[PDB]
Structures are given as C-alpha cells and as structure tokens.
Amino acid sequence: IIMFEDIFVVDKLDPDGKKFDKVTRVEARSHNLEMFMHLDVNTEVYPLAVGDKFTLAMAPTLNLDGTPDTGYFTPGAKKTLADKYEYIMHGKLYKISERDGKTPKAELYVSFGGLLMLLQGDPAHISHFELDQRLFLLMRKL
Amino acid sequence: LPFRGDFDGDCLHGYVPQSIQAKVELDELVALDKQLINRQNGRNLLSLGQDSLTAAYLVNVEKNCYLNRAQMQQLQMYCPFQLPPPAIIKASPSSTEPQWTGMQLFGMLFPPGFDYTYPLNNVVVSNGELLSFSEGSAWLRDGEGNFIERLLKHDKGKVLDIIYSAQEMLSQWLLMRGLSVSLADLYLS
Amino acid sequence: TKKVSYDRDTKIINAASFTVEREDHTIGNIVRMQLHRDENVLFAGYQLPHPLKYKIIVRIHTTSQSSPMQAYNQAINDLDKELDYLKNQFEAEVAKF
Amino acid sequence: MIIPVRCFTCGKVIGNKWDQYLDLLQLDYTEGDALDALQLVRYCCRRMLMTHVDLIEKLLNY
Amino acid sequence: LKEPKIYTHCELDLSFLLGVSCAVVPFANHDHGRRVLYQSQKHCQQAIGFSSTNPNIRCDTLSQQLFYPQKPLFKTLASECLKKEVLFNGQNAIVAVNVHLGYNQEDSIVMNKASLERGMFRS
Amino acid sequence: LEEQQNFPFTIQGIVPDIVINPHAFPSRQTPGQLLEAALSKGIACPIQKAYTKLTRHATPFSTPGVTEITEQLHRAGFSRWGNERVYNGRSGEMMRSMIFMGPTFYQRLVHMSEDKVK
Amino acid sequence: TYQRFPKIKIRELKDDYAKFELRETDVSMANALRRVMISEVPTVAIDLVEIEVNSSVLNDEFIAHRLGLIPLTSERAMSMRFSRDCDACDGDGQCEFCSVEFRLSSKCVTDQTLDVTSRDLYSADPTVTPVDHKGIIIVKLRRGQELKLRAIARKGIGKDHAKWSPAATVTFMYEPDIIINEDMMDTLSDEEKIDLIESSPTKVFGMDPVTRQVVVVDPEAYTYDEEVIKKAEAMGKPGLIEISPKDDSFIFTVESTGAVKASQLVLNAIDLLKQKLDAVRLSDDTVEA
Ligand SMILES: [Mg+2]
Ligand SMILES: [Zn+2]
Ligand SMILES: [Zn+2]
C-alpha cells in the first residue's frame, strides 16, 4: 500500500530557469502534515512552476499486494500493476540523520539513482523507513 | 603516463631477452602488474588519460540525459559487471520505456562491496554504486584520495581490467555525444 | 570453415554469446535492432573487440519461454522476408516511371 | 600536376569538367558563379575546381 | 591617415613586417608566439610540395614531390603582390574536431582510408 | 585508417577525412585555425540568393573580425559558428552535439615511417 | 516480434539522381543499406596495366593510378567472378569471365599539342567501355612524345580500393515535422517575427503577405542548424517552436556516378543484403537440430 502520502506546494526553485540542461532543486512543504521536500527533478521533460499542487507516495513495491519484492530489472506488465501516477522513480535509501533544537528535525536522505531528496519533519511520520531499503517515488501533478 | 611522452613523433626503444633467467625476472619485478605503486609520490601510477577523464567528468556532471534500454545493454558488454535496476520507471506521460540514469551508468566499474567516500566532492559509494555528486573533479585524476588508489587498496588483482573497461566503454559513450570546439566556444558570448 | 561459432555461457541460465567471422557493422546493427523489437529478448548487443581483426560478438540473454538458439532464426528470417517485401515494393515503383 | 579525375572525399568525377571551366572563366563570370553552371552544390567538389594549379603548361615547354 | 593631419609618413602595409615564410600564414597574430615560430622556420622547410620543373638536369638525393599540389582557398596580400603560387605546399582537407574512439589521443590524427587511394597526400 | 562508411556523415554528403583531437586546442593555444576553417568554408560553399561582397583575404595583420565571418557564413545555409549537425556512421543515430567542420590547409612532413625503423 | 512493412514513395527518378522515401522503419535499415551501397556493391575498374613505352612528362606510375579511377560501365557486374574465385586463365588476357583487356595507343606527330582522352581506350569486349562533353584527360604530348600501354580490368569489391565504389554521395535524413504554437504567435510584434524569419539559415519559415502569419513552406530543408529554436529561446517567447525528428519516414538522395544505373544500385544492394544474411543461419543450423 502507501507508507507515506502528502500534498505539497512548490515554494522556490534553485536554478529558477528554463532549458538549462540541468536538474532543478524544487523545494516544497506540506500544509496538513508539516513536511519539507527537496526533490531534484528536471523541468524539461516534466514542467513544474512556482506554486502548484501534486501528490507524492512512497511504496516499497509496485505489485499491489501481489509480490513482496520488485524482481528483475525490466519489469513487464503483469496483473494490473500500479500505473495511476505520472512520475514514477526508483532508488535506495542510504542515510537516516536526526537533529536537535526543534521537535520536527528528523530528516531523511534518499537517492533515486544520481539525484537526491531530503525529507525533514517530525519522527512520527518517517518512523516506518529502515536503512538500505529499496523504495519508490510515485508522483502525479493535478 | 609513466613514459611521459606523446604521439607527436616519439620513438620507443625495445630490448628483447633471450635467457630464461632474464625472462622470468621480467614478469616478476619489472612488468606492469608489479610496479603499480608510484614510489616517488606514494600513490597510483596509471591514472586516467585525456578522453577518459573528460568522459568520466561529463557522465557525472551532465545529469540530464536519459538513455533508454536500447543503448544501455550495448555498453554493458565492455564492463564485466551486470546491469543495475532502472532508477526511472516513468519520467513523463509521453515516455513509456524505463530510462536509465547517467550516474547509474558509472556504477558498472565499481565491484560489489566497494566503499569509498570523498568529503570535498560529497560522493558516496555504497555497495558498488555511487549515490551522490555535487561539483567535483578532484577524485578522478592524480590527487590525494581517488577511486583508483582505493581500488588498488581493495583487491589489487583486476585494476588493469577496470581501467581498461573504464576506457573502452567511456570512449563509446563519448562517441554518442561528440566533443567539438566551435567558434562559439572561442566567442564565449 | 565454421564461420559461425556457438558459445554457451554457464553463469547465467538461458544465455548465449554468438560470434561470426569476417563481418562488419552492417550485421551487428541490423540484428541487434531486430532482436530489440521482439518481446522475449532482454539483452541484445554487438561488440567489436579489435578492429584489426574481423569478428563481431553478439550476446543474447532471453527468458525461459524460448531458447537463445531459436531466437536467432526468427530474427534472421524477419529481415530475409522484409527485404523481399522491400524489393517487391521497389520493382513496381521503378516500373511505374 | 593535372586536375584529378575524382574528388578526394566524395567520389564525383570532375576530370572532364576542366576545359569547360577555363572556357567559362575566359568570360566575365566570377569563380563562385562558374561552378553553379557545372552542377556542383557541395563545397567538397568545388574546392578542387576553385583551387588547383595548372603545372602541365609549365612542364610542357621542355 | 584620413582623420589626423599630424602624420608625415605612413607604412605601405602592416603585413610587410614579417619574412616570406611568415607573412603568408593566415592570422599570424592570433596564434601563440611559440606556435608561429614553430612553423615559420621549422615546418615549411621540411614540407613536401612543388619541386624543380626540370627533373632531367638536377640530380640530388632526397628530391621528393607531391602528385597533386594545391594552392589554399584564402589569398593573402603577401601572396598577391608577389605573383607566385609555389610557396604553398600541401593539400586541403575538410577537418572535423571529434573524439573518435580514443584513436587520436595525445596529439594524434586519424585519417580516411578511402581518401588516400584517390590521390590525396600521395607523393 | 578508418573506412569511409564508419565516419560520421553529414546530411549533404561530405565525409571528414582528417579528425583531430579537440583536447590539443587549449594547450597548444592556436586560435585562428577555427577562423581559417570558417573563412575557407564560406568562400567554397555556394550562395543561394552576391559573389563579390565576400571577404577572402585573411591578411596576417589586417584580419577580418568574427562578426564578418559569422555573417558571411550565415548567408548560404550553414550555421554562424561553423558547426553543423552530424550523424553516426556505425549506429546511424543523431549526435547530441554538433561538430565543427572546415577545409583547412595541412602539410605533410619529411619524417616517414620506413626511414626510422631500426 | 515479427517483421515490419516498409513503405516507399519515389519523388523523382532519372539517371544517377534517384530520390525515394522510406517510411515505417528505424534508422538501422537506412544506415545498413547506405553502408552497403557506398562500399560493398561490386563494379569493374582497371587494376593491372602494362606500359610498353612511355615518353611523356608524367611518370609511368602516376598514369597507372589515374587509369584505375576511370568510371567504367558494368552491366554484368554481379554475374562475373573475382580474380581469386577464378582459378583458371592464369590472368593476363581477355578471359571473358574474370577480366577484360584495354589497348591504349597514341602518338603526337603534328605541331600542336594533342591530349589523349577517355574515349580513346578501345576494349576487345564492347560491353565494358568508359562512359562519356570532352572526357577524362590523361597526358599531354609534345611533338615527338608517344604513349602505348595495355590495361586489364577486373571485378572488385569497393571495400579494398576507392575505385570500385559506384556511389559518390549516398546519404539520408530524418525528414522532421515542425509545429508552431499558434497561441503564442500573436505575442510577438511584426518586427520580432521579421527578425525571427531572417535568423534562419535556410528558407524554412515564410510569411503570409495578407495576414502576417508564420506559415511553414518546404519543411524538408531545415538541415538541423538549431538556429530558429535558439533565437526564440533568447527572446520573450520560450518554447514557441518545438522541433523533434521522426523515428521513421526517411528520404534517400543517391548518386550512381554514371557507372551503373541508379535503379540498379539499390536493387543490387538488397540482392546482396539477402545473401550476406544467408550464410550465417545455415552455418548455425546444425547446432540447433
Ligand atoms: Mg613527443
Ligand atoms: Zn567533392
Ligand atoms: Zn579469369
């Protein structure tokens, strides 16, 4: 199923341009669960603007309760897999760090290949994530 | 690079042995698989060349090329390791095939079990797959801490089979992109 | 003698490595893209190790539904019958003029 | 020496279109306009006709 | 010369300050100071090209000659007032800067097999 | 010595017969060869349409500027900076970066291969 | 899984300038045909000469190189055997199965200087003749200089030497389709559209003189200069013109240089691509059953 689901809003872009042949550090924050997104995504193939609405999910598998693992590299279509989203990524978690000073200071470091993503928030929501886990990044702009 | 010469007309002297006592001693103390440590500096001797250094830079700095599974399995033949799983399943609604990542292509040279961390370039290599990169080029050439010396300290048995596949694959990758100096490069405007 | 050689790998089940002699890039690029059109070929690629010699190496890693030997005739005949359809289409168009 | 029969890169035969090039260069035509009348569209087969020394008229005196 | 009425002399041309092997090189000031000195008296002296037009009276060792010599596309002012097209040796070639499989590494040149058989660079 | 079909071919039909390394440019420090290759290309290619207003002097101490070559090469169908989109010879696909091309003037030296074997 | 079905459409067809389309196929069918048509299809060319007397100005080895580049015709080009395939006849003569003879003979006795031509080579077989304007000049003889030789021409593959290839320029392009965003065209003024039209190197984008609209005329001559996209990129309208190449629908501009016909070039190419892919599957058939 879904381990974490939220609706964010684009705050600021770090390059803040168009057709820069690079990746944009799209900073986002929640409004109902007090989260913070730092996902890198290129604007050329997936256009994002300052101020929008998009849902984000994070599941350990895409078989929809049919298999507890991913499987091979090239996964064929089998038994109506979860394809309702538009932006699907894959990556492995590598670092879980905490911080003092505030209650919502537990960050989350994940790498979807060569990109990076920071998830700073309270430790109650990201408590279900272990170390060296194979996660997914389901996203859909609405 | 040990010869310190280019291909603009330099010659090479060749001495041939005849005795067995001069033949067994050549592949024991003199040959390239034995003097892999440059004892003048205390580090690696055979670093990256001119094309391989630029290709290993561009692969990890460009970050905005998504090659599909058609031109990925062709580059998996020059490397002795298998293919990683695709980090991108669907980057766009107008895209169907799972496209790979440029930094995921550089993980076909590090063996499973390689641990390497460089703090000045923020690159972390965990279980034979690099995961981070932010504006660095010092961990590739002859510096203080680089992946060639960390591979020579890891196993020291197949480093000459690693730098060879780090050239015969990076050349075929750079042929697909093309490096050319045009007039707009001198104009800089 | 023995222009095509069959070498079967051991570490990967249902895997082969085909090689021919005295060829060039005209076959390694027309067989790889034909194998990529099929749905039972997970790995297809040509490699020229030494350009001074004349020998290409094709590696085919298929699934358990078919052998990696039976997935070669279906990629050769798919071009051998496509060239006939191209010739039958060009011979009428050159006869129209 | 003489004009080569084929182009060094393309392969188009240009050995015969040398007398009719000097015959059109005898008029008031430009060197950039005397090649358009011989049906040469690429700059590979035009540098042979534009830049070539005629050494045989200096070598035939003796 | 047209704007200031203070001058009493003038040079004929600014290109007439170099030697005959250096004032015919195109863009002689754009190059490096140790890269036109490496060509004006080090490459033109050993470049094959034109030779003596009478090879029946001159008998000397190492008398090489190109088959198809070619004047360059450009026409410098030091090669127009001289009325001589013998000081330009070598042929033209459509070059292209490209990393070609690492075979042109460390100041090397990869060439064409189907161009050296049609008359280019044959001597 | 590569064969003709393996070189990166262009749309018009030209084939590069000499391919040099681009790494030798910021170390030998020789500019003006890319200017010679852009001035010899604009005077050899035909104008679509003016075969009199073009500059072909290339005087050593009276060099024409970049704004005169990049506006003379633009009036014939090629790009301003001299580079053009090339394809692949082995695979056949397009390249992500253009390749500069131009008819330079190369000389052959005396020092051959058979005169140095010993 | 199975085969494809390519569709063609010939635009114009004359001698050595055949132009045809090639739709519904990938690039490895338009490249692996060009690489065969430019170097693999065999013609005939002069290989071995035999100079009896040479009193001209040029050397006796400069003429043997020039005589081999003459574009001889070849109608029985695929029906003949090679020199190594024909073990008989020991070379040196008109075998009429693997070789043909030529006889050049000329002498200048008049006052004016006469030059020999490619129309002076008389062969014993009138089916292999040099094509023909003036013709290919070889030498120029003074008063008292003669030239007489004997040439032997044979069928050869154009991969060995560059004299057997009958294709000078055979290329293909992707034939892209361009689209204009009509919702953002009215943002720019008239002078911006004029400056955007004049920024193109080739005549790709025109203008309607009754409504001032950017109308696409002749889209097959874009040549991928990438000067129209970068012009609107550094302006007040990014992403105005999006240009992407098609994966199919290529066009072929072949040339046959007068040796063979342009129609017989792409026929002998696909008649040899059917036998190059023939000895591979029969030599790998005994390891399957
Ligand atoms: Mg040297
Ligand atoms: Zn040409
Ligand atoms: Zn015979």
UniProtKB/Swiss-Prot annotation, chain A:
<keyword id="KW-0539">Nucleus</keyword>
<protein>
    <recommendedName>
        <fullName>DNA-directed RNA polymerases II, IV and V subunit 8B</fullName>
    </recommendedName>
</protein>
<dbReference type="Pfam" id="PF03870">
    <property type="entry name" value="RNA_pol_Rpb8"/>
</dbReference>
<dbReference type="InterPro" id="IPR012340">
    <property type="entry name" value="NA-bd_OB-fold"/>
</dbReference>
<dbReference type="GO" id="GO:0000418">
    <property type="term" value="C:RNA polymerase IV complex"/>
</dbReference>
<comment type="function">
    <text>DNA-dependent RNA polymerase catalyzes the transcription of DNA into RNA using the four ribonucleoside triphosphates as substrates. Component of RNA polymerase II which synthesizes mRNA precursors and many functional non-coding RNAs. Pol II is the central component of the basal RNA polymerase II transcription machinery. It is composed of mobile elements that move relative to each other.</text>
</comment>
<comment type="similarity">
    <text>Belongs to the eukaryotic RPB8 RNA polymerase subunit family.</text>
</comment>
<dbReference type="InterPro" id="IPR005570">
    <property type="entry name" value="RPABC3"/>
</dbReference>
<dbReference type="GO" id="GO:0006351">
    <property type="term" value="P:DNA-templated transcription"/>
</dbReference>
<dbReference type="GO" id="GO:0005665">
    <property type="term" value="C:RNA polymerase II, core complex"/>
</dbReference>
<comment type="subunit">
    <text>Component of the RNA polymerase II, IV and V complexes. Associates with the mediator complex.</text>
</comment>
<dbReference type="GO" id="GO:0000419">
    <property type="term" value="C:RNA polymerase V complex"/>
</dbReference>
UniProtKB/Swiss-Prot annotation, chain C:
<keyword id="KW-0804">Transcription</keyword>
<dbReference type="GO" id="GO:0046983">
    <property type="term" value="F:protein dimerization activity"/>
</dbReference>
<comment type="similarity">
    <text>Belongs to the archaeal Rpo11/eukaryotic RPB11/RPC19 RNA polymerase subunit family.</text>
</comment>
<dbReference type="GO" id="GO:0003677">
    <property type="term" value="F:DNA binding"/>
</dbReference>
<dbReference type="GO" id="GO:0003899">
    <property type="term" value="F:DNA-directed RNA polymerase activity"/>
</dbReference>
<keyword id="KW-0539">Nucleus</keyword>
<dbReference type="GO" id="GO:0006366">
    <property type="term" value="P:transcription by RNA polymerase II"/>
</dbReference>
<protein>
    <recommendedName>
        <fullName>DNA-directed RNA polymerases II, IV and V subunit 11</fullName>
    </recommendedName>
</protein>
<dbReference type="GO" id="GO:0005665">
    <property type="term" value="C:RNA polymerase II, core complex"/>
</dbReference>
<comment type="subunit">
    <text>Component of the RNA polymerase II, IV and V complexes. Interacts with NRPD1, NRPB3 and NRPE3B.</text>
</comment>
<dbReference type="GO" id="GO:0000419">
    <property type="term" value="C:RNA polymerase V complex"/>
</dbReference>
<keyword id="KW-0240">DNA-directed RNA polymerase</keyword>
UniProtKB/Swiss-Prot annotation, chain F:
<protein>
    <recommendedName>
        <fullName>DNA-directed RNA polymerases IV and V subunit 2</fullName>
    </recommendedName>
</protein>
<comment type="function">
    <text>DNA-dependent RNA polymerase catalyzes the transcription of DNA into RNA using the four ribonucleoside triphosphates as substrates. Second largest component of RNA polymerases IV and V which mediate short-interfering RNAs (siRNA) accumulation and subsequent RNA-directed DNA methylation-dependent (RdDM) transcriptional gene silencing (TGS) of endogenous repeated sequences, including transposable elements. Proposed to contribute to the polymerase catalytic activity and forms the polymerase active center together with the largest subunit.</text>
</comment>
<comment type="similarity">
    <text>Belongs to the RNA polymerase beta chain family.</text>
</comment>
<comment type="subunit">
    <text>Component of the RNA polymerase IV and V complexes. Interacts with SSH1, NRPD1 and NRPE1.</text>
</comment>
UniProtKB/Swiss-Prot annotation, chain G:
<dbReference type="GO" id="GO:0046983">
    <property type="term" value="F:protein dimerization activity"/>
</dbReference>
<dbReference type="Pfam" id="PF01193">
    <property type="entry name" value="RNA_pol_L"/>
</dbReference>
<dbReference type="InterPro" id="IPR050518">
    <property type="entry name" value="Rpo3/RPB3_RNA_Pol_subunit"/>
</dbReference>
<dbReference type="InterPro" id="IPR036603">
    <property type="entry name" value="RBP11-like"/>
</dbReference>
<comment type="subunit">
    <text>Component of the RNA polymerase II complex consisting of at least 12 subunits. Interacts with SHH1, CLSY1, NRPB11 and NRPD1. Interacts with IYO.</text>
</comment>
<dbReference type="GO" id="GO:0010374">
    <property type="term" value="P:stomatal complex development"/>
</dbReference>
<protein>
    <recommendedName>
        <fullName>DNA-directed RNA polymerases II, IV and V subunit 3</fullName>
    </recommendedName>
</protein>
<keyword id="KW-0007">Acetylation</keyword>
<dbReference type="GO" id="GO:0005737">
    <property type="term" value="C:cytoplasm"/>
</dbReference>
<dbReference type="InterPro" id="IPR001514">
    <property type="entry name" value="DNA-dir_RNA_pol_30-40kDasu_CS"/>
</dbReference>
<dbReference type="GO" id="GO:0006351">
    <property type="term" value="P:DNA-templated transcription"/>
</dbReference>
<keyword id="KW-0240">DNA-directed RNA polymerase</keyword>
